[PDB]
Design an enzyme around this catalytic site. Structure first.
Site, short mmCIF file in Angstrom:
data_model
loop_
_atom_site.label_atom_id
_atom_site.label_comp_id
_atom_site.label_asym_id
_atom_site.label_seq_id
_atom_site.Cartn_x
_atom_site.Cartn_y
_atom_site.Cartn_z
N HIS A 293 0.82 -1.22 0.00
CA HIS A 293 0.00 0.00 0.00
C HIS A 293 0.85 1.27 0.00
CE1 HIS A 293 -3.36 -2.74 1.05
NE2 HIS A 293 -4.07 -1.83 0.42
N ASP B 86 -5.05 5.62 -0.98
CA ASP B 86 -4.39 4.88 0.10
C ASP B 86 -3.40 5.74 0.90
OD1 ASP B 86 -5.39 2.14 0.29
OD2 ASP B 86 -4.43 1.78 -1.64
N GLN C 245 -5.28 -17.28 -4.19
CA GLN C 245 -5.45 -16.38 -5.33
C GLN C 245 -6.57 -16.84 -6.26
OE1 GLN C 245 -3.48 -13.14 -6.36
NE2 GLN C 245 -4.09 -13.39 -4.21
O1 LIG Z 1 -4.64 -10.58 -3.60
C1 LIG Z 1 -5.56 -10.35 -2.82
C2 LIG Z 1 -6.02 -11.34 -1.84
O2 LIG Z 1 -5.39 -12.57 -1.79
C3 LIG Z 1 -5.92 -13.25 -0.67
C4 LIG Z 1 -6.59 -14.50 -1.16
N1 LIG Z 1 -6.74 -15.42 -0.05
C5 LIG Z 1 -8.03 -15.78 0.54
C6 LIG Z 1 -7.70 -16.85 1.58
N2 LIG Z 1 -6.29 -17.02 1.36
C7 LIG Z 1 -5.76 -16.22 0.41
N3 LIG Z 1 -4.48 -16.42 0.26
C8 LIG Z 1 -4.19 -17.43 1.15
C9 LIG Z 1 -2.97 -18.04 1.39
C10 LIG Z 1 -2.97 -19.04 2.34
C11 LIG Z 1 -4.10 -19.41 3.02
C12 LIG Z 1 -5.33 -18.83 2.81
C13 LIG Z 1 -5.32 -17.83 1.85
C14 LIG Z 1 -7.03 -10.92 -1.08
N4 LIG Z 1 -7.64 -9.69 -1.15
C15 LIG Z 1 -8.73 -9.34 -0.26
C16 LIG Z 1 -8.18 -9.03 1.09
C17 LIG Z 1 -9.07 -9.20 2.28
C18 LIG Z 1 -8.67 -7.82 1.83
N5 LIG Z 1 -7.26 -8.73 -2.04
C19 LIG Z 1 -6.28 -9.03 -2.84
C20 LIG Z 1 -5.81 -8.08 -3.80
C21 LIG Z 1 -5.49 -8.25 -5.12
C22 LIG Z 1 -5.08 -6.98 -5.57
N6 LIG Z 1 -5.14 -6.07 -4.60
N7 LIG Z 1 -5.59 -6.76 -3.53
C23 LIG Z 1 -5.72 -6.14 -2.28
C24 LIG Z 1 -6.84 -5.39 -2.02
C25 LIG Z 1 -6.96 -4.80 -0.78
C26 LIG Z 1 -5.97 -4.96 0.17
C27 LIG Z 1 -4.85 -5.71 -0.11
C28 LIG Z 1 -4.72 -6.31 -1.34
MG LIG Z 2 -7.04 0.99 0.67
ZN LIG Z 3 -5.62 0.64 -2.84
#
Ligand SMILES: O=c1c(OCCN2CCn3c2nc2ccccc23)cn(CC2CC2)nc1-c1ccnn1-c1ccccc1
Ligand SMILES: [Mg+2]
Ligand SMILES: [Zn+2]
Length: 315
Positions: A71, A110, A272
């Site tokens: 961020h 941000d 992802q």
């Molecule tokens: O890449 C992202 C992402 O990956 C997480 C996927 N998950 C789910 C369970 N789990 C995951 N990895 C795991 C690995 C291991 C176990 C369970 C796991 C999740 N979120 C949402 C986040 C809650 C605010 N946002 C983005 C994203 C893409 C682009 N900008 N951006 C973003 C947006 C806002 C803030 C930060 C980033």
């Molecule tokens: Mg934000």
């Molecule tokens: Zn942002």
């Protein structure tokens, strides 16, 4: 610093590439502030802002981004670029006032992020949670924007009437708050409803507000719309930040959720893939439906989704 920004001219070799949705600002760090200036001048016009005031503002926005993993200043400009690309391909649909507002909103959306989610700040009773009960960081992000504008020689909207001033700040406010992912789901739901019922009307202000908010989410998540080499590297920065927040929970003897747990690193691809299917794909799908020209965002997101599938399957 800001004096040198006025002298800057974007290299000719990048004039076409910058117009592409999947353009990566990555390799052009020292150009990022000028790249923003470029996009503002082409989208709003050279006569839109006072050059010196704009340059002061940008540099102050820059310094007010902390050295967090994701961020940060790079993310600010990246999002600002996606907004540019969206606005350039839908030139008629958005008012002169909206174009200025949205590009600024994206650059500031941000501001002064600490690398902690709203959940973290509210759970651990941070002073900003004590101040902004919901959409915590987002209200601070806007608050920081107003502060930077209220600095001497930083008020870029001074040549706009009192009425135009209060309009553009509301456009910025709604757009920065719309970047709260918690609000995206409800928003995108109502938008799809209005699409399939055909009640979507861009004359209606609150319908405009919904579309802009989706555009915000789209521009905010646009790391998933870049070429795979770029998307993959940016995914590292996102998780580095997730895990650092998780580490801060570990320091209190609190187990974080697997997403924020670095000991659950192996499930990142599947994490992802799910995020792509549940959040990213529907976002760009609904946006593409509302704005057909933004279609290259969905396509690119589809490509990275399959790359993640291949990672899971081992290819
Ligand atoms: O890449 C992202 C992402 O990956 C997480 C996927 N998950 C789910 C369970 N789990 C995951 N990895 C795991 C690995 C291991 C176990 C369970 C796991 C999740 N979120 C949402 C986040 C809650 C605010 N946002 C983005 C994203 C893409 C682009 N900008 N951006 C973003 C947006 C806002 C803030 C930060 C980033
Ligand atoms: Mg934000
Ligand atoms: Zn942002």
């Amino acid at each position: 610093e800001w004096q040198g920004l006025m002298q800057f001219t974007l290299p000719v070799r990048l004039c076409k590439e910058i117009e592409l949705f999947h353009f990566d600002i990555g390799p052009f760090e020292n150009m990022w502030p000028g790249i923003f200036v470029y996009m503002v001048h082409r989208s709003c016009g050279t006569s839109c802002f006072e050059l010196e005031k704009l340059c002061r503002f940008i540099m102050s926005v820059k310094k007010n981004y902390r050295r967090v993993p994701y961020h940060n200043w790079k993310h600010a400009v990246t999002v600002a670029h996606c907004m540019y690309a969206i606005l350039q391909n839908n030139h008629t649909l958005f008012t002169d006032l909206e174009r200025k507002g949205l590009l600024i909103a994206c650059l500031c959306h941000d501001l002064d992020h600490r690398g902690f989610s709203n959940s973290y700040l509210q759970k651990f009773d941070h002073p900003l949670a004590a101040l902004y009960s919901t959409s915590t960081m987002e209200q601070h992000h806007f608050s920081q924007t107003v502060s930077i504008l209220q600095l001497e020689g930083h008020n870029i909207f001074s040549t706009l009437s009192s009425s135009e001033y209060e309009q553009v700040l509301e456009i910025i406010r709604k757009a920065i708050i719309a970047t709260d992912l918690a609000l995206y789901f409800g928003n995108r739901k109502q938008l799809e409803e209005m699409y399939q019922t055909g009640s979507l009307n861009l004359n209606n202000q609150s319908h405009r507000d919904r579309v802009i908010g989706l555009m915000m989410t789209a521009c905010d998540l646009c790391s998933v719309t870049k070429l795979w080499p770029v998307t993959k590297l940016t995914a590292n920065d996102i998780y580095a930040e997730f895990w650092a927040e998780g580490d801060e929970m570990k320091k209190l003897g609190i187990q974080p959720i697997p997403m924020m747990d670095r000991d659950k690193k192996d499930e990142v691809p599947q994490g992802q893939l799910g995020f792509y299917n549940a959040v990213a794909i529907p976002c760009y799908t609904t946006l593409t439906q509302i704005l057909p020209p933004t279609e290259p965002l969905l396509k690119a997101c589809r490509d990275n989704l399959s790359q993640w599938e291949k990672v899971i399957r081992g290819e």
